[PDB]
């Protein structure tokens, strides 16, 4: 209902945590558990190869159907461009139902 694809057996969920580094433990014994730790974190590179299938327009629509294109005029900040601050955004949302496929 949020559009997209559904699967009876969808790609899994990836879960991670940082190894519990128990801080300095008491010299003498204690029955309780350890709460003290060392604030730490990590980084890394996320790789995700998504293969894709497609069906291209084979229609004989004689007239030039409509396409999607950035407006060909001159604007201050280019679309999907990075504002002079690196922070970039998206000018507008985009759909797929563009190619005029005969019903």
Partner 1 sequence: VTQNEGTKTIANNLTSTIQVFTDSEYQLPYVLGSAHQGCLPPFPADVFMIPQYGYLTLNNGSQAVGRSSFYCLEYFPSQMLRTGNNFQFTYTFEDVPFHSSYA
Is position 63 an interface residue for partner 1 (rule: CB under 8 A)? yes
The C-alpha atoms of residue 92 and residue 77 are separated, in whole angstroms, by 13
Applying CB under 8 A, the span of 5-13, 35-43, 77-85, 95-103 interacting with partner 1 comes to: 95-103
Applying CB under 8 A, the span of 22-30, 33-41, 42-50, 59-67 interacting with partner 1 comes to: 59-67
Applying CB under 8 A, the span of 10-18, 23-31, 57-65, 81-89 interacting with partner 1 comes to: 57-65
Contact between 14 and 47 (Cβ < 8 Å): no
- Closest contact distance (angstroms) between CB of 94 and partner 1 is 16
For residue 85 the two structure tokens come to 């601050």
Is position 103 an interface residue for partner 1 (rule: CB under 8 A)? yes
Report the 10 Å Cβ neighbour count for 94: 8
Of the candidate residues 28, 43, 58, 76, the single one contacting partner 1 (CB under 8 A): 58
Give the residue carrying structure tokens 């001159």. Answer: 74
Report the 10 Å Cβ neighbour count for 54: 4
Q: Where are the beta strands (DSSP E) in 1-103?
A: none
Positions touching partner 1 (CB under 8 A) are 58-63, 65-66, 100, 102-103
């Amino acid at each position: 209902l949020m559009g997209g694809f559904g699967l009876k057996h969808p790609p899994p969920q990836i879960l991670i945590k940082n190894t519990p580094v128990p801080a300095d433990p008491p010299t003498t014994f204690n029955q309780s558990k350890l709460n003290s730790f060392i604030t730490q974190y990590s980084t890394g590179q996320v790789s995700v190869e998504i293969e894709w299938e497609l069906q291209k327009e084979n229609s004989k629509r004689w007239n030039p159907e409509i396409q999607y294109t950035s407006n060909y005029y001159k604007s201050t900040s280019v679309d999907f461009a990075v504002n002079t601050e690196g922070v970039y955004s998206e000018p507008r949302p985009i759909g797929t139902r563009y190619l005029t496929r005969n019903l």
